[PDB]
Amino acid sequence: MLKEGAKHFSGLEEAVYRNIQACKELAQTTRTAYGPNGMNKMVINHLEKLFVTNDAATILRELEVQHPAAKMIVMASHMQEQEVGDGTNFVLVFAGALLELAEELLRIGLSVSEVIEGYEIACRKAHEILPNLVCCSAKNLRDIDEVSSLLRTSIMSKQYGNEVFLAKLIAQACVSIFPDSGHFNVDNIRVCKILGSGISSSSVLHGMVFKKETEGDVTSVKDAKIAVYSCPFDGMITETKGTVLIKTAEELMNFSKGEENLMDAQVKAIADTGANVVVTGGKVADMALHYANKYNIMLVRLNSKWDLRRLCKTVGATALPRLTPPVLEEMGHCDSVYLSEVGDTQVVVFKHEKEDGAISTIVLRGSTDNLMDDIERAVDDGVNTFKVLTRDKRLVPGGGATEIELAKQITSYGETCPGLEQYAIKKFAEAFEAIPRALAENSGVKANEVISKLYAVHQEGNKNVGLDIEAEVPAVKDMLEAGILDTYLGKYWAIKLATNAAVTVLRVDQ
Amino acid sequence: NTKRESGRKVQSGNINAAKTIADIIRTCLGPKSMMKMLLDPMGGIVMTNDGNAILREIQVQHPAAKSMIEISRTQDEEVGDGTTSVIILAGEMLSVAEHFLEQQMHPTVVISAYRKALDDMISTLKKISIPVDISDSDMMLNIINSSITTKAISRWSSLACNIALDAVKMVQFEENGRKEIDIKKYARVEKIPGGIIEDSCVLRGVMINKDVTHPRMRRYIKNPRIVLLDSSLEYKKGESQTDIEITREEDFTRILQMEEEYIQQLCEDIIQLKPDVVITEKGISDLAQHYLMRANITAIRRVRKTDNNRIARACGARIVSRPEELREDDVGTGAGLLEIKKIGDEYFTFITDCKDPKACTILLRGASKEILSEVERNLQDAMQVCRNVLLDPQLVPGGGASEMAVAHALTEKSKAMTGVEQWPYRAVAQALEVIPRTLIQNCGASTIRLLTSLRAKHTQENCETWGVNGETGTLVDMKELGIWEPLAVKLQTYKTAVETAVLLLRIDDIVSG
Amino acid sequence: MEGPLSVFGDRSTGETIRSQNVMAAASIANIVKSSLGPVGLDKMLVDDIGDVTITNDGATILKLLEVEHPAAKVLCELADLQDKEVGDGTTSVVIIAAELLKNADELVKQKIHPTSVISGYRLACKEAVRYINENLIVNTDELGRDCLINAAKTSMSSKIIGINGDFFANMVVDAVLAIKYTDIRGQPRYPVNSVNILKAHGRSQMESMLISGYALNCVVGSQGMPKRIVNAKIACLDFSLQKTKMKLGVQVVITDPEKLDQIRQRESDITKERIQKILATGANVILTTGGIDDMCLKYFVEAGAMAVRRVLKRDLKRIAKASGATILSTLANLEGEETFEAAMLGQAEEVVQERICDDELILIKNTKARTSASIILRGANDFMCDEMERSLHDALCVVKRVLESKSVVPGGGAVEAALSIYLENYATSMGSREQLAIAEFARSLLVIPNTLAVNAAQDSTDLVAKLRAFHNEAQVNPERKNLKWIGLDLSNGKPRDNKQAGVFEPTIVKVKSLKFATEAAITILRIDDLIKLH
């Protein structure tokens, strides 16, 4: 500070200005990233690996910032995308415009604790009409059209075009078989994409898809107990050293000769352990194969952890490197163990399915994985909004159409309550139009055009916009009545989480 | 030539010069004031609550710094006051409106919000303006003494108003009391250098300082004969041209004395008859006028025919070409008081012309000739509010609560208007409320919570009538508090205010030629 | 002025000066764009330092800017010349010229004969020019429901200052009917402002009052001398009766002021003598231009005499022209003993003095030599009469201008917004150079309406969405009607619903300005070889 000491990241500009920078600075791309969008935002890794996300996190978790608040608020966006799903971009984009209001209240010079409460009581006042803005609920998981609609706004507010087809797919993923009564498998149903075919050819499979190549004669039974091992056959090459390296140079050679008898007795023990599918993260080899052909066990030639862990998870298995003949602590959890060729590619298909504990593994297909990876992002939007764990989700109009419902009132309620308080309440309800503006300016029309119409249409829950021509001029799309809705829960956490950080980050002078 | 000028840069400098000029002047405004002290490039300091006095005496610049004094002077002449309002009002509206609205990117809807805000402003004013008696100088006093205390001076609040109160009522027009239009040649003020406020009083009529300038002239002869030129003293004063010689150097001295020797005969035919008054609009030369002063014929000159015509009938007269030629007879005396006061060696002829258009040049004095001026500067604004109470008996209370009274009334029309125009019409609204806020932030504490209490007060209690106190900041009644913002003076500042900002809107571009 | 620093005088050869000129045309034409149209913002422009002017008119701006560049020079003087044609299209002809001089010059380089590219900007002009007169499609004042009457009401309703325009629907058609002057060269053109139009407020602002014959507004209240005797005749007088100095035989040569007092004395009587010489001539109403001093007037008024002094001359002349009176007949001077004859007497059914709305005029009823009419406005205040007056002016000229040349265009660049793809297809089938130039000409049309709407903040993408989405190749037809709205109303920026509106231009300046728009382009072509005087 004034002194040799005091290493400080915030205060003065930093507090006043520079926090609001990374607030609005990061809130930039989420303006494009929530609500109906195609927006191409090209993200590559430290691998510099091409990708585009319409969800903030892959932009967010990609990024690097010395601003802890901006580094924090994502955890609320996390807490969104953790508890919830699409609407994660909404988290950041809301607060940033709301936060500028406080700094302009600091351009007014308004006291922190005084601006603090104005967002909060108004939030619970927004949370007051938020259930009042519950219009419908999500009636039946068993109803595809309920879940498609559930998936629609989900995929839409990331990707508007692919919306309903996917929304019909993952609704007909029949994840409804998970009652959402307090059980739904999120990972056990996880997508396994197929590079190749179409993304319209992208479908849902039930039972665990494993795109990795079947080896050995396919499983002797189905319900075949599942030996999931990190390297049961990597070859007989040594697993045995603490650093997994050479001790003396003579050990690697013996692994060629007794390989047969090992890869006999080993997968013989796989036949002996009861596993008719042994999953080898290490390499498939002929002797294993040849003997797993004699023993008719399906080898799973090579494994991602995502393969292994899921098999470690879903099967209850433990993936372990093996040379000696192994045993099953693993067995199966799976009552049908398949090699199927899906996407035309050989696909290991494990299946056990229950109202609670099913695996319905969506098989995406498509010419590019840089398609399906962002598609999965757009798809996981609804996979999330599936899990609310109120089957009837108390849908409020999605797409921010029920904003102006709150927006008009809380800000009219704004002047109702008094003082430096009332401004932050008024400011609170002024941050609604941001997302529609952000969206309508993704379709390229200002709020005031759009929003004065949303002000003109008054109490609807219906009107909002942001990718369409009806987005442009009319300020009328149905983000309610057209099949776009959103659960109270997400919309709660949409308001709730966007409420929390914005206030809490306001304190820091360091 | 290849030149073009782009967009915001002028508009910024407009908004820049707009608000900056507004800053100190709006803090110089109000019961709690400030001072704008210039420091001349020479080292002389100039401290005035009026930046119009400061800016004209310092650098005046091509942007609205050029356009602020014009509309200030436009606000200077008409009513006589609001001088500090327009630049703090125009600097007020343009900033808050444009940028946000030019961030919404449009000139046009911004232009309309002015005329939008104009009527609601007219509306809630004319509504919540309070009619005050035209014929009661006391009911005039509380409204008229409020407009004196406005700028730098409460000193002449009682005195200037008192001198202003009855005079303006006692004025008339060509179209008729005074009332109606703004004519300030019926508001006239001529100084009495030195003197005292006790020697001063209300002169409801006109004085001619040049009527009697000497004890020799007609004095206190109360049936006047005022004479317009044409025979006794003719239109032509030209040379006699007797025995002129172009070949003589002595004739050069002769031709200049010969001008007045014919004028000598002109004022001599005044002597041959002696109509007790003589007026000449081209003025009389001295050598002839000495003879006028021998005949006790008051010599009126360097004050206009229209002036004298308005004074003659109002003091009474029969005009003739020459008294031996009577065109027709008029009334002998039109006034009740013919008074010549002497302060210094100068004689000041005060002819009270009662219920007369006249020139209404009103007797006023300070202790010295300088504070004598602050009688007039207040008298003007006093006579302004005198003519205003005559013009508009209805005039608002406010501490600037009118500037809220409109803004929320704007807002509640703005809420009713909606459209995109809602935002400009509201972006014009919140501008108005910084003016009284600066008055009551000069007071202190939270002037927002005040405006909260204000806009609470607005529809709750009242808008402008039950107001905010410029010396306090609490919610009060400016009528009860006796503070008054004159309706005309209010609206007039705004008519002048709205336009310059529209010009600054219109101008993204200038030239050097 | 970019290019080399060694040589100068518009000498780069090169395209440097040429690009400079398309830049030199730009900035000059750029100034007009924000001034383009009435919605063009008034531009405060500093002529020296304190010398400053606020102008949204291109031509007036073009007057201010001293042109070192010929590009600047060929754009200014020509829009200054189109301003001296009419002045409709000043801001128009400027803008398109910025593109077309790059369109005019460029392809002449590419040859296909040197002369070809130029007529392409002339032919597409004539194409449009032929299309111009073809347009009643929007703004029909060549015909209409009331035609010119509702065209007034509509051109009122366009500029309308109130719920009025109804009484002002008729006033404008009176303006062509009240003026019978039938302008020279066989034109039945009637100047709209040549009518006696005497602005007098009072009562309902909505009201206005036509007068049988031309009306003469005379001063009221400063004449106690009777202006009122119901008569068949006025004495139209350019003439004066003064008590003070009618003539001087006594000068400052005379040392005594008394000797003029005596000639000052006689002149007061001959005024009484003069006014009863006209009464002896038989006119119990006279229209006098003269007057006296206020002191004299105060005495002379209360003395009494028959005169109407200081009559408006433009009315006096027209009425004397209308009634048959002369402003001068037997009077060679101002003397009050001069005899008066009947040649200065007006011939009409009656001279009757009607004071209504606190307003009295000398009303010459049915002036016999020629039909005459004068519309007395009624405002709530004086500005209201001016308020309603300018809204008439839309209605006024447009009634007059369609009489100048028949039909019109739909105003604004919407009329050309259809012509663009018309003339780019009229380019397209031509091919070769003739697809190039002819399309270059039609594409350059389209900046006007946007920048028109831009000045009104209805802008560009909005208007091109508005314009040639309406405009079609499916309907290319001017028709008489709208299967496309090709009109653009500007106080607005957007095409509107008023198809009699006087805020759409007539057919006149259009055929002109396009040639001038083609002109400023082809104008700069002309230099042969190149040199530097050094």
Which of B124, B381, B465, B493 is the catalytic position? Answer: B381
CB–CB of B245/B267 below 8 Å? no
Reduce the DSSP state of residue B19 to 3 states and report it. helix
Other Cβ atoms within 10 Å of C49 Cβ, number? 10
List the single best residue of A408, A411, A448, A451 to mutate versus B (max B Cβ within 10 A).
A448
Contact B420 A110 (CB under 8 A): no
Q: Chains meeting B at 3+ CB pairs closer than 8 A?
A: A, C
Backbone phi and psi for residue A346, each to the nearest 5 degrees, phi listed first: -55, 125
Cα(B287)–Cα(C104) distance, integer angstroms: 80
Token pair in block for residue C419 = 């012509």
Query: Annotated binding residue at C247?
Result: no
| Backbone torsion region of residue A461, taken as left when φ is above 0, otherwise alpha when ψ lies between -120 and 50, otherwise beta | left
Reduce the DSSP state of residue C312 to 3 states and report it. coil
CB–CB of A78/A52 below 8 Å? no
Contact B269 C42 (CB under 8 A): no
Cα(B501)–Cα(B510) distance, integer angstroms: 16
Residue C424 is which amino acid? E
Chain B residues touching residue C20 (CB < 8 angstroms): 2
Catalytic residues of C: 57, 90-91, 394
Cα(B456)–Cα(C51) distance, integer angstroms: 49
Chain B residues touching residue A456 (CB < 8 angstroms): 418-419
What would you report as the CA-atom Rg of chain C, rounded to the nearest whole angstrom?
A: 30
Token pair in block for residue A422 = 């009332």
Q: Is C299 on the interface with B (CB under 8 A)?
A: yes
Chain B residues touching residue A452 (CB < 8 angstroms): 418-420, 422-423
User: How many angstroms separate the CA of residue A129 from the nearest CA in chain B?
Assistant: 21
Return residues 99-158 of B near C (CB < 8 Å). Answer: 106-109
Contact B449 A110 (CB under 8 A): no
B449, closest residue in chain A (CA to CA): A419
Q: Is C67 on the interface with B (CB under 8 A)?
A: yes
Cα(A405)–Cα(A401) distance, integer angstroms: 8
Cα(C414)–Cα(C494) distance, integer angstroms: 9
Active site residue B230: no
State how far the alpha carbon of A326 is from the alpha carbons of A62, A223, A275, in Å: 41, 19, 10
Cα(A419)–Cα(A117) distance, integer angstroms: 11
Cα(B439)–Cα(B447) distance, integer angstroms: 9
Chain A residues touching residue B423 (CB < 8 angstroms): 448, 452
- Residues near C170 by Cβ (< 8 Å), separated by ≥ 6? C149, C152, C210
Chain C residues touching residue B321 (CB < 8 angstroms): 243-244, 261, 264-265
Closest partner residue to A108 among B105, B448, B456, by Cβ?
B448
HEC per residue, C432-474:
HHHHHHHHHHHHHHHHHHHHHHHHCCCCCHHHHHHHHHHCCCC
Token pair in block for residue B163 = 């001198």
Cα(B177)–Cα(B139) distance, integer angstroms: 17
HEC per residue, C205-274:
CCCEEEEECCEEECCCCCCCCCCCCCECCCEEECCCCCCCCCCCCCCCCCCCCHHHHHHHHHHHHHHHHH
Sign of CA dihedral B305, B306, B307, B313: positive
CB–CB of A423/A108 below 8 Å? yes
- Residues near A458 by Cβ (< 8 Å), separated by ≥ 6? A404, A408
User: How many angstroms separate the CA of residue C319 from the nearest CA in chain B?
Assistant: 30
Task: Please state whether beta strands C235-237 and C286-288 pair in parallel, antiparallel, or not at all (unpaired).
Answer: parallel
Cα(A402)–Cα(A436) distance, integer angstroms: 11
- Residues near B253 by Cβ (< 8 Å), separated by ≥ 6? none
Number of H helices, E strands in chain B: 16, 9
Which of B27, B48, B50, B213 is the catalytic position? Answer: B50
Place of tokens 């057919």: C507
Active site residue B333: no
Other Cβ atoms within 10 Å of C386 Cβ, number? 15
Helices (H), A34-160: 56-60, 68-83, 88-108, 112-132, 144-156
Residue C369 is which amino acid? A
Cα(C352)–Cα(C365) distance, integer angstroms: 7
- Continuous segment of H or E residues that includes residue A19: helix A19-33
The secondary structure of residue B57, as a DSSP letter, is T
* Terminal alpha carbon distance of chain C: 18
Cα(C171)–Cα(C152) distance, integer angstroms: 8
Helices (H), B203-331: 250-271, 286-294, 305-315
State how far the alpha carbon of A51 is from the alpha carbons of A38, A44, A369, A487, in Å: 14, 6, 10, 29
Q: Is A415 on the interface with B (CB under 8 A)?
A: yes
Contact B420 A422 (CB under 8 A): no
Other Cβ atoms within 10 Å of A142 Cβ, number? 12
**Nearest C-alpha neighbor of A398 from the set A340, A462, A453:** A462
CB–CB of A95/A89 below 8 Å? no
Closest partner residue to B234 among C42, C260, C293, by Cβ?
C260
Cα(A128)–Cα(A417) distance, integer angstroms: 15
Cα(C160)–Cα(C276) distance, integer angstroms: 49
Cα(B363)–Cα(B162) distance, integer angstroms: 11
Reduce the DSSP state of residue C104 to 3 states and report it. helix
State how far the alpha carbon of C451 is from the alpha carbons of A10, B158, C32, in Å: 47, 58, 9
Reduce the DSSP state of residue B272 to 3 states and report it. coil
| Backbone torsion region of residue B302, taken as left when φ is above 0, otherwise alpha when ψ lies between -120 and 50, otherwise beta | left
Residue C299 is which amino acid? Y
- Continuous segment of H or E residues that includes residue C66: none
Task: Please state whether beta strands B277-280 and B298-301 pair in parallel, antiparallel, or not at all (unpaired).
Answer: parallel
**Nearest C-alpha neighbor of B379 from the set B366, B392, B367:** B366
CB–CB of C116/C433 below 8 Å? yes
Cα(A66)–Cα(C152) distance, integer angstroms: 69
User: How many angstroms separate the CA of residue C174 from the nearest CA in chain B?
Assistant: 33
Reduce the DSSP state of residue C70 to 3 states and report it. helix
What method did the depositors use to determine the structure?
cryo-EM
Token pair in block for residue C74 = 């060929």
Cα(B367)–Cα(B338) distance, integer angstroms: 24
HEC per residue, A442-488:
HCCCCHHHHHHHHHHCCCCCCEECCCCHHHHCCCCEECCCCCCCEEH
Reduce the DSSP state of residue C505 to 3 states and report it. coil
Closest partner residue to A419 among B105, B423, B452, by Cβ?
B452
**Nearest C-alpha neighbor of B338 from the set B206, B216, B217:** B206
**Nearest C-alpha neighbor of B464 from the set B403, B374, B393:** B403
Helices (H), B304-396: 305-315, 369-391
Beta strands in C270-418 (DSSP E): 286-288, 348-356, 359-367, 373-377
Chain C residues touching residue B284 (CB < 8 angstroms): none
- Continuous segment of H or E residues that includes residue A272: helix A259-272
Task: Please state whether beta strands C235-237 and C215-217 pair in parallel, antiparallel, or not at all (unpaired).
Answer: unpaired
CA angle, residues B251, B254, B260, in degrees to nearest 5: 155
Cα(B378)–Cα(B163) distance, integer angstroms: 10
Contact A452 B455 (CB under 8 A): no
Q: CB-side exposure of A321: number of CA atoms within 13 Å?
A: 11
**Nearest C-alpha neighbor of C129 from the set C448, C512, C518:** C512
Contact B423 A452 (CB under 8 A): yes
Chain B residues touching residue A418 (CB < 8 angstroms): 452, 456
Token pair in block for residue B216 = 């020799």
Other Cβ atoms within 10 Å of A192 Cβ, number? 24
Name beta bridge partners: C363: C215, C352
Token pair in block for residue B156 = 């002449």
B505, closest residue in chain C (CA to CA): C41
Cα(C62)–Cα(A329) distance, integer angstroms: 94
Cα(C66)–Cα(C71) distance, integer angstroms: 12
Query: Annotated binding residue at A156?
Result: yes
Reduce the DSSP state of residue C112 to 3 states and report it. coil
CA angle, residues A391, A395, A401, in degrees to nearest 5: 160
Place of tokens 């013996």: A254
Cα(C283)–Cα(C343) distance, integer angstroms: 11
Characterize B182-214 residue by residue with b for buried, 16 or more Cβ atoms within 10 angstroms of its Cβ, and e for exposed. Answer: bbbebbbbbbbebbebeebbbbbbbbbbbbbbe
Closest partner residue to C42 among B325, B503, B512, by Cβ?
B503
Return residues 233-252 of B near C (CB < 8 Å). Answer: 233-242
**Nearest C-alpha neighbor of B156 from the set B319, B477, B375:** B375
The secondary structure of residue B238, as a DSSP letter, is -
**Nearest C-alpha neighbor of B167 from the set B363, B34, B422:** B363
- Residues near C89 by Cβ (< 8 Å), separated by ≥ 6? C79, C82, C505, C509, C510, C512, C513, C516
The secondary structure of residue A34, as a DSSP letter, is S
